[PDB]
Nucleic acid binder design. Structure first.
Ligand SMILES: C/C(=C\[C@H](C)C(=O)C[C@H](O)CC1CC(=O)NC(=O)C1)[C@@H]1OC(=O)/C=C/CC/C=C\C=C\[C@@H]1C
Ligand SMILES: [Mg+2]
Ligand SMILES: [Mg+2]
Ligand SMILES: [Mg+2]
Ligand SMILES: [Mg+2]
Ligand SMILES: [Mg+2]
Ligand SMILES: [Mg+2]
Ligand SMILES: [Mg+2]
Ligand SMILES: [Mg+2]
Ligand SMILES: [Mg+2]
Ligand SMILES: [Mg+2]
Ligand SMILES: [Mg+2]
Ligand SMILES: [Mg+2]
Ligand SMILES: [Mg+2]
Ligand SMILES: [Mg+2]
Ligand SMILES: [Mg+2]
Ligand SMILES: [Mg+2]
Ligand SMILES: [Mg+2]
Ligand SMILES: [Mg+2]
Ligand SMILES: [Mg+2]
Ligand SMILES: [Mg+2]
Ligand SMILES: [Mg+2]
Ligand SMILES: [Mg+2]
Ligand SMILES: [Mg+2]
Ligand SMILES: [Mg+2]
Ligand SMILES: [Mg+2]
Ligand SMILES: [Mg+2]
Ligand SMILES: [Mg+2]
Ligand SMILES: [Mg+2]
Ligand SMILES: [Mg+2]
Ligand SMILES: [Mg+2]
Ligand SMILES: [Mg+2]
Ligand SMILES: [Mg+2]
Ligand SMILES: [Mg+2]
Ligand SMILES: [Mg+2]
Ligand SMILES: [Mg+2]
Ligand SMILES: [Mg+2]
Ligand SMILES: [Mg+2]
Ligand SMILES: [Mg+2]
Ligand SMILES: [Mg+2]
Ligand SMILES: [Mg+2]
Ligand SMILES: [Mg+2]
Ligand SMILES: [Mg+2]
Ligand SMILES: [Mg+2]
Ligand SMILES: [Mg+2]
Ligand SMILES: [Mg+2]
Ligand SMILES: [Mg+2]
Ligand SMILES: [Mg+2]
Ligand SMILES: [Mg+2]
Ligand SMILES: [Mg+2]
Ligand SMILES: [Mg+2]
Ligand SMILES: [Mg+2]
Ligand SMILES: [Mg+2]
Ligand SMILES: [Mg+2]
Ligand SMILES: [Mg+2]
Ligand SMILES: [Mg+2]
Ligand SMILES: [Mg+2]
Ligand SMILES: [Mg+2]
Ligand SMILES: [Mg+2]
Ligand SMILES: [Mg+2]
Ligand SMILES: [Mg+2]
Ligand SMILES: [Mg+2]
Ligand SMILES: [Mg+2]
Ligand SMILES: [Mg+2]
Ligand SMILES: [Mg+2]
Ligand SMILES: [Mg+2]
Ligand SMILES: [Mg+2]
Ligand SMILES: [Mg+2]
Ligand SMILES: [Mg+2]
Ligand SMILES: [Mg+2]
Ligand SMILES: [Mg+2]
Ligand SMILES: [Mg+2]
Ligand SMILES: [Mg+2]
Ligand SMILES: [Mg+2]
Ligand SMILES: [Mg+2]
Ligand SMILES: [Mg+2]
Ligand SMILES: [Mg+2]
Ligand SMILES: [Mg+2]
Ligand SMILES: [Mg+2]
Ligand SMILES: [Mg+2]
Ligand SMILES: [Mg+2]
Ligand SMILES: [Mg+2]
Ligand SMILES: [Mg+2]
Ligand SMILES: [Mg+2]
Ligand SMILES: [Mg+2]
Ligand SMILES: [Mg+2]
Ligand SMILES: [Mg+2]
Ligand SMILES: [Mg+2]
Ligand SMILES: [Mg+2]
Ligand SMILES: [Mg+2]
Ligand SMILES: [Mg+2]
Ligand SMILES: [Mg+2]
Ligand SMILES: [Mg+2]
Ligand SMILES: [Mg+2]
Ligand SMILES: [Mg+2]
Ligand SMILES: [Mg+2]
Ligand SMILES: [Mg+2]
Ligand SMILES: [Mg+2]
Ligand SMILES: [Mg+2]
Ligand SMILES: [Mg+2]
Ligand SMILES: [Mg+2]
Ligand SMILES: [Mg+2]
Ligand SMILES: [Mg+2]
Ligand SMILES: [Mg+2]
Ligand SMILES: [Mg+2]
Ligand SMILES: [Mg+2]
Ligand SMILES: [Mg+2]
Ligand SMILES: [Mg+2]
Ligand SMILES: [Mg+2]
Ligand SMILES: [Mg+2]
Ligand SMILES: [Mg+2]
Ligand SMILES: [Mg+2]
Ligand SMILES: [Mg+2]
Ligand SMILES: [Mg+2]
Ligand SMILES: [Mg+2]
Ligand SMILES: [Mg+2]
Ligand SMILES: [Mg+2]
Ligand SMILES: [Mg+2]
Ligand SMILES: [Mg+2]
Ligand SMILES: [Mg+2]
Ligand SMILES: [Mg+2]
Ligand SMILES: [Mg+2]
Ligand SMILES: [Mg+2]
Ligand SMILES: [Mg+2]
Ligand SMILES: [Mg+2]
Ligand SMILES: [Mg+2]
Ligand SMILES: [Mg+2]
Ligand SMILES: [Mg+2]
Ligand SMILES: [Mg+2]
Ligand SMILES: [Mg+2]
Ligand SMILES: [Mg+2]
Ligand SMILES: [Mg+2]
Ligand SMILES: [Mg+2]
Lengths: 58, 159, 99, 105
RNA sequence: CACGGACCAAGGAGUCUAACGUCUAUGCGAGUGUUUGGGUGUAAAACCCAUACGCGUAAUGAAAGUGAACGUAGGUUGGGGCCUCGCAAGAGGUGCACAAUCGACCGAUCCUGAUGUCUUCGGAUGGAUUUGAGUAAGAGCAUAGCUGUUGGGACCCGAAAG
RNA sequence: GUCGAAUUUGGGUAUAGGGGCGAAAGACUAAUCGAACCAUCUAGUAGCUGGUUCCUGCCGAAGUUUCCCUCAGGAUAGCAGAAGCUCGUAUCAGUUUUAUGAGGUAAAGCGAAUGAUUAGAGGUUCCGGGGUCGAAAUGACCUUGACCUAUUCUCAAACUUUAAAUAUGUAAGAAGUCCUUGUUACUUAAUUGAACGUGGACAUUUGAAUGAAGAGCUUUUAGUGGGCCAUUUUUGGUAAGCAGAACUGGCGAUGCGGGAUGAACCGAACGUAGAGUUAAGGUGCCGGAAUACACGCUCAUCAGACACCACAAAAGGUGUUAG
RNA sequence: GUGAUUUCUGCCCAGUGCUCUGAAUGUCAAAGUGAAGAAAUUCAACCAAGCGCGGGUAAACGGCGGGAGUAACUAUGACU
RNA sequence: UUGACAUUGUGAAGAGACAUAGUUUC
RNA sequence: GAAGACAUUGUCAGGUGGGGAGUUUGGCUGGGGCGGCACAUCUGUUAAACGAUAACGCAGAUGUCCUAAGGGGGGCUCAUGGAGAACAGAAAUCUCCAGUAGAACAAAAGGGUAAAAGCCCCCUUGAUUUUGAUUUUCAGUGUGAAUACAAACCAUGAAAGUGUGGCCUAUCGAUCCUUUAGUCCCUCGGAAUUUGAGGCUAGAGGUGCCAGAAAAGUUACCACAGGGAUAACUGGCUUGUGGCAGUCAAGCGUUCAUAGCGACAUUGCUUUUUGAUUCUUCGAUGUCGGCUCUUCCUAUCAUACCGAAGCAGAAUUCGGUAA
RNA sequence: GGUUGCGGCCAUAUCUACCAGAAAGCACCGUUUCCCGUCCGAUCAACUGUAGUUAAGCUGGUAAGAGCCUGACCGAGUAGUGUAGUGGGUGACCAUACGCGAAACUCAGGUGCUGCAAUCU
């Protein structure tokens, strides 16, 4: 008893109903997978400049 | 049965370009990448470490990380009906700065200028691009150039 | 028989459980019955109260030992100290616990 | 494959915590005691009637085993395991490959 | 040129229950739930109630255990609405919910190991591409309904068998 | 067939269901036997077969992905409904343009590499073999081989320097561009850089086109998980109304006009109706609609007559036509 | 098991079975023995029948070869 | 089927140990 | 009288035990079975120049092998060919020239590589330690394999550097359980010490039907739920094979291609061969042959009339109208 | 302009055969005590810059040179291809419509450009 094995028939019809949604985009993306040595430093850098602003609001 | 390893189907893709084998020229290593840069991806077959998978050949993405011998590139790949974010660790040998952007950067830098050149003068700018327009009228002269009359030519064999 | 994102459940209904279903339809009846029992016993029991003097006692275990609670009966020492014997204590409506 | 009987490699015991000389040897399973809870649960399960009460594997396919190296730091005494690719012939005794010699007689 | 069905009446198949997911309505709300039981009655109703208990208000570890503010309970970007100016268009101020991102807090893991000590107990403090169904001015508890889930004769009728 | 005995036969009596009894057939054990009958466990289980009861309104599928003792079944994703929720000129796009990449198919190529392949021509042997001269020769001369040089005819799914068309990644700004100069434990020879910032400057021709019954987002759940067909690309097969892929469009789930007929072709997609005009297809009669106009061709003692489509070939004619 | 009479009933005990006045230092249970241990326990020795070894057995189940050569034509092959 | 334990007692001879008095075991 | 603490019996222990019980006895598949593995994979092609993509498609390969064939460093240049040197020959060893790789790099194949990734030498264990992120397969789960960083500790080199196994693309494995390594850490719940046991972290023992059951046959004595998702039989597409008929004309035929024939080629037709397919029928359309009986086709065996002949006559052969 | 050291693009730089090259540079070149490496001071190491030379390296020029590079209505709007028809044809295939559009070929032109630093009649 054999049957069809494979086809893409009708698959792009299905993907286009709800649509192929474009990637979606953020200002400030995640630092996921960014160099730890960088991030460690970036963390103190930021801390530093925050301080220097809250200070400038003494 | 079937076969679908990593570098499957890539015979001509990662192949090396006629009379261009060997050491990669040093300019490939002197180039410099910063997070945010736009890069095109294309595999140097002679550089097995740090290779893009063949799906990403011909593809263009953005740098998100700079590493000792590499850059991390984010490519948007569509699976099913949606894109997912992909992150690539590529050695600098498999990447170049895309010029997909120069026409923009060059156009911006220029757009500022003729805006200054207008304003300062007393406006009237118009600096959006425009499609090819149809042609205007014109008068073609016959002088030195009377029209040659051609006709269709008979059937003939040569052989 | 497993689908969707649902919690895994444990409904023990794999025996002939429909043969052991007690529905308390007789909740009202029993209450009434229990009330009549008390009215009856009160009457038989002349002027005595329906219950016995139970002792105070500190509840067991770290969890309830903060609270104090009715105990079974008084203890031979208690009874003695309150100036009575237990045989008599028992007839005078007081509960006595040798344990 | 033949591997050396000694190995300068990383020793991760509180006081060594550096590359030290290790003696290399090959792991052998170890006798099974009754009184492991498994054997205990199994012996109870198997008593009385009702025959074999637990599956018994037959459909064997592999013809090798991954070799494991016991590695003992001669200083701090401590041992590390290290497991090798599937091979069919293993030794750690010597006999190194040799330069460019004739085939004998 | 597959099956059922000559005809007609009458019967004739997604149900109820335990425990659930989402959604919604209602009561109350850091709580909530009178109905095991007691009280009471015009008597299985309606009305009333003490102590517990259950879920929630804390998490994280296999465990012993430990246990949620550097700060206006943080910074950044967007943000309805409101506020201020303006005739208006607009500008600025504030920005709940929600979203993205970077931090801080609690537990686990790893590291650091102060003042001290029944000299091996003690574990302050500052940390780490680690890790949690967490904190960060609570949202739950209950009743009820549609739909869906598992156990049940389980939509109804049907084995050869044991 | 046998008919005086291993004969026929009444009644009584024994053997009972994994049991009996068997001159043995799996026979017989009350029309029941390769395990009797009765009741109960029991509404046994069923991925299988059958059926599943009122109307109208709106929306509207799948036969694909992945895993499964999986292949007539599930789970998972997709497709579908419902509920909405947060916002709104906003952001959006099965499209174009512009700019900038990727690719090795079609074609092409072979007096370019690899591999095949037809033919000569001219070379080269102390050196592959024959043969004449020879005492031989690293001798001479013919001879046929290979090899070399420049030519020559022909080829490739698993060959190629070149190399399309169609298809395909990214970009076309306020999340932008420029000036000033703060933070750090990273990094530099270095206040050097890198990343994140403060303060300042420029508004809708702010940075192509076209469109936008808006855009984003969340939960949950049905059916489905046999598919089949046509144009084009295309594998296996002599071939198939055969078996298997690719992209789209359809049929399945869909009536309506045409193709007489017909799931899939052509036209065209449906609320109840009037008037009009068309599609595809027709207009001698059947049959609504010119036995219309116009130039040719064709005469068949088995003419011909409309795509899909319901078949005809090599070959041949001093029939006729035009060249 | 075979199946009246008559006649005959060959060779094979390696295998599977069956069977035995066999042998024995190989294997081998519970109890009992010994050693270690604080004990739980661990190890050892001894050790029944059986198994293994040796013998018997086909009117037990069953079995009962293959390749070359060779005689005065050829063929055949007593013979190797 | 084979072993051990229990049913299981009494003598005698012979082996076996505290290591060549008899409690004990074959 | 016999027999005698032995038999017997009771309880455990080993042997034996189809007499009996219970159960099992893969999947894909042009039906099923035998086979093979398209069942977990790798290279090239099919594949239609991004990616994806099927068939029991095509040509192959995988369950390994390596203490160096891993790591670092220096030096060097390979296949082949020419011309040269006692014994020495086609092939021994020595030299120079040419040499884009025509070699070599475990292995299939593809890619890659020349002061190297090949060959020779020198030093070595980074094939190590911790725990995350990422790419392929994808559900964006797992597993395999791989990438780029962080934090250690080392190797090598004058150094920049390189090194987290083998130049790249394959070379493999859950839960339970056992076992080992780890810290000397948690628990054993009335309190302790010590054995024992149990937890935590990371490995090994393996599932090849490779997301991973513990598994022999027979049924013609057979049984059930289904299947026209599926074979055997009519019928349908096909026409390789079978059968039948042509075209060309080298030959056959004393001479002479075509009276009668006909090679090498090549165009067809037929559906009483056989295959190929699997559309319809498995809740039934009862096989083969014969008997009987009707009707039809023509590719005509006889009978009517003809044209040919290597037709003298007789006989025959070829052809036409003819069923 | 030459030359050298370090280079970028990596043949317009390569290959074959000739010839020309001042000045400096580079080179060839002399040596073997010392570090160092070899069967061999050929390479590699050191020492002299003295003793010698443009022969070679190097650089440049020549050639109806081989190769390579660039261009063209040279071939060719050809081959191929996206879209269309109830177009032709038994078929194999082929025309047409709206677009995109090669490779070979042929001919012409060319044969390294250039950055940093030091040096030179
Ligand atoms: C196969 C075995 C070990 C495997 C590594 C393994 O993990 C098996 C696994 O434990 C099976 C369990 C898993 C589970 O979750 N539940 C189960 O019930 C079964 C054992 O085999 C052998 O080691 C040798 C085996 C050689 C042959 C002889 C014996 C096999 C025994 C072992 C079954
Ligand atoms: Mg099937
Ligand atoms: Mg089929
Ligand atoms: Mg299917
Ligand atoms: Mg393949
Ligand atoms: Mg590697
Ligand atoms: Mg219950
Ligand atoms: Mg049950
Ligand atoms: Mg009752
Ligand atoms: Mg009371
Ligand atoms: Mg027990
Ligand atoms: Mg230790
Ligand atoms: Mg029909
Ligand atoms: Mg049916
Ligand atoms: Mg009927
Ligand atoms: Mg009715
Ligand atoms: Mg009242
Ligand atoms: Mg009452
Ligand atoms: Mg009370
Ligand atoms: Mg706790
Ligand atoms: Mg503690
Ligand atoms: Mg910030
Ligand atoms: Mg504002
Ligand atoms: Mg603000
Ligand atoms: Mg913390
Ligand atoms: Mg943890
Ligand atoms: Mg929780
Ligand atoms: Mg909770
Ligand atoms: Mg149900
Ligand atoms: Mg039944
Ligand atoms: Mg029954
Ligand atoms: Mg059963
Ligand atoms: Mg029986
Ligand atoms: Mg029975
Ligand atoms: Mg019985
Ligand atoms: Mg029989
Ligand atoms: Mg009956
Ligand atoms: Mg039922
Ligand atoms: Mg039933
Ligand atoms: Mg099924
Ligand atoms: Mg609709
Ligand atoms: Mg399985
Ligand atoms: Mg399926
Ligand atoms: Mg069905
Ligand atoms: Mg290709
Ligand atoms: Mg090709
Ligand atoms: Mg081609
Ligand atoms: Mg061609
Ligand atoms: Mg070409
Ligand atoms: Mg060629
Ligand atoms: Mg030519
Ligand atoms: Mg596009
Ligand atoms: Mg696009
Ligand atoms: Mg608009
Ligand atoms: Mg709108
Ligand atoms: Mg759904
Ligand atoms: Mg679904
Ligand atoms: Mg589903
Ligand atoms: Mg189905
Ligand atoms: Mg169509
Ligand atoms: Mg259907
Ligand atoms: Mg339609
Ligand atoms: Mg008519
Ligand atoms: Mg009419
Ligand atoms: Mg046509
Ligand atoms: Mg028709
Ligand atoms: Mg004519
Ligand atoms: Mg017999
Ligand atoms: Mg007989
Ligand atoms: Mg007899
Ligand atoms: Mg005889
Ligand atoms: Mg004999
Ligand atoms: Mg025998
Ligand atoms: Mg024993
Ligand atoms: Mg035999
Ligand atoms: Mg005895
Ligand atoms: Mg006895
Ligand atoms: Mg007995
Ligand atoms: Mg038996
Ligand atoms: Mg049986
Ligand atoms: Mg099968
Ligand atoms: Mg099957
Ligand atoms: Mg078959
Ligand atoms: Mg098979
Ligand atoms: Mg398949
Ligand atoms: Mg499989
Ligand atoms: Mg693999
Ligand atoms: Mg592709
Ligand atoms: Mg895919
Ligand atoms: Mg290779
Ligand atoms: Mg080099
Ligand atoms: Mg290893
Ligand atoms: Mg999983
Ligand atoms: Mg993995
Ligand atoms: Mg190597
Ligand atoms: Mg594998
Ligand atoms: Mg341990
Ligand atoms: Mg303890
Ligand atoms: Mg405790
Ligand atoms: Mg206890
Ligand atoms: Mg302890
Ligand atoms: Mg212990
Ligand atoms: Mg499987
Ligand atoms: Mg599987
Ligand atoms: Mg099995
Ligand atoms: Mg059976
Ligand atoms: Mg069928
Ligand atoms: Mg035929
Ligand atoms: Mg035929
Ligand atoms: Mg034929
Ligand atoms: Mg026939
Ligand atoms: Mg001829
Ligand atoms: Mg003639
Ligand atoms: Mg002739
Ligand atoms: Mg059929
Ligand atoms: Mg049938
Ligand atoms: Mg039927
Ligand atoms: Mg019938
Ligand atoms: Mg009939
Ligand atoms: Mg005829
Ligand atoms: Mg005639
Ligand atoms: Mg004649
Ligand atoms: Mg007739
Ligand atoms: Mg007729
Ligand atoms: Mg000079
Ligand atoms: Mg010397
Ligand atoms: Mg010298
Ligand atoms: Mg030197
Ligand atoms: Mg000169
Ligand atoms: Mg030079
Ligand atoms: Mg030239
Ligand atoms: Mg075309
Ligand atoms: Mg057409």
């Amino acid at each position: 008893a054999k049957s069809k094995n494979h086809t893409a028939h009708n698959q792009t019809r299905k993907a286009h109903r709800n649509g192929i949604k474009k990637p979606k985009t953020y200002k400030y993306p995640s630092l996921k997978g960014v160099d730890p040595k960088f991030r460690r430093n970036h963390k103190h850098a930021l801390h530093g400049t925050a301080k220097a602003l809250a200070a400038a609001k003494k | 049965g079937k076969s679908h390893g990593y570098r499957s189907r890539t015979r001509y893709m990662f192949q090396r370009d006629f009379r261009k084998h060997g050491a990669v020229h040093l300019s490939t290593y002197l180039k410099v990448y910063k997070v945010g840069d736009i890069v095109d991806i294309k595999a140097n077959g002679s550089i097995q470490k740090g290779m893009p998978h063949k799906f990403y050949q011909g593809k263009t993405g953005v740098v998100y990380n700079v590493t000792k011998s590499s850059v991390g590139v984010i490519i948007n790949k569509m699976v099913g009906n949606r894109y997912l974010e992909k992150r690539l660790n590529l050695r600098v040998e498999h990447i170049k700065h895309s010029k997909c952007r120069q026409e923009f950067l060059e156009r911006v830098k220029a757009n500022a200028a003729k805006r200054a050149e207008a304003k300062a003068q007393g406006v009237a700018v118009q600096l959006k691009r425009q499609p090819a327009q149809p042609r205007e009228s014109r008068i073609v002269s016959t002088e030195g150039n009377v029209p040659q009359t051609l006709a269709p030519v008979p059937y003939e064999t040569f052989i | 028989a497993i689908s969707k994102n649902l919690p895994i459940l444990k409904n023990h209904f794999r025996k002939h459980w429909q043969e052991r279903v007690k529905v308390h339809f007789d909740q009202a009846g029993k209450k009434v019955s229990r009330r009549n029992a008390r009215a009856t016993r009160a009457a038989k029991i002349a002027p005595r109260p329906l219950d016995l003097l139970r002792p105070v006692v500190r509840a067991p275990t770290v969890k309830y030992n903060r609270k104090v609670r009715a105990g079974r009966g008084f203890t031979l020492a208690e009874v003695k100290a309150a100036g009575l014997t237990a045989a008599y204590a028992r007839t005078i409506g007081i509960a006595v616990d040798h344990r | 494959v033949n591997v050396p009987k000694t190995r300068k490699t990383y020793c991760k015991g509180k006081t060594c915590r550096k590359h030290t000389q290790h003696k290399v040897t090959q792991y052998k399973a170890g006798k099974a005691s009754l009184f492991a809870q498994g054997k205990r649960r199994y012996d109870r399960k198997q008593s009385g009637f009702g025959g074999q009460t637990k599956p018994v594997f037959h459909k064997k396919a592999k013809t090798t085993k991954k070799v494991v190296l016991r590695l003992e730091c001669v200083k701090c005494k401590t041992r590390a395991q290290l497991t090798l690719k599937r091979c069919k012939h293993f030794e750690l005794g010597g006999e190194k490959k040799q330069k460019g010699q004739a085939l004998q007689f």
